[PDB]
Amino acid sequence: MKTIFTKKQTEELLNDISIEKQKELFNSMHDFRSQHAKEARIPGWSDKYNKLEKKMLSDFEEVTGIKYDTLESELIWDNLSNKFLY
Ligand SMILES: [Zn+2]
């Protein structure tokens, strides 16, 4: 679904935020997404999962200044994962 910012706006933001801050956000997204993959198809959400989720949300807001939402986060993830290698 359409995101709160355009695709072009999101690209241009990621041409402005520093590479080190982008990498920070990539790593916290990567850690969350990996844990989500382990728990996606089974009951419950572990305390570890919740901890990683909360970290990701906090880093998202710190690095981007954008109120967290799942769709704009996805669009940012796709851009970050294209650039960075865990
Ligand atoms: Zn689950």
Residue numbers in the entry: 1 to 86
What did the authors write?
Furthermore, we demonstrate that the AcrIIA28 interaction prevents the target DNA from being loaded onto Cas9. Finally, based on our observations, we concluded that AcrIIA28 can inhibit the DNA-cleavage activity of SpyCas9 by directly interacting with the REC3 domain, which then can prevent the target DNA from being loaded into the Cas9 active site.
Finally, the 1.45 Å high-resolution structure of AcrIIA28 was determined, and the final structural model was refined to Rwork = 19.75% and Rfree= 20.36%. The crystal belonged to space group P41212 and contained a single molecule in the asymmetric unit (ASU). The structure of AcrIIA28 consisted of four α-helices (α1–α4). B-factor analysis highlighted high rigidity, with low B-factor values (average 25.3 Å) for most of the structure, except the α3 region (average 48.2 Å), underscoring the rigid conformation of the AcrIIA28 protein in solution. During the structural refinement step, we found a big round-shape electron density, which exhibited a typical metal ion density, around the α3–α4 connecting loop region of AcrIIA28. This metal ion density was coordinated by oxygens from the main chain of E39, I42 and G44. To reveal the identity of this metal ion, we used inductively coupled plasma mass spectrometry (ICP-MS). This analysis indicated that Zn2+ was the metal ion, with a detected concentration of 105.3 ppb (μg/kg).
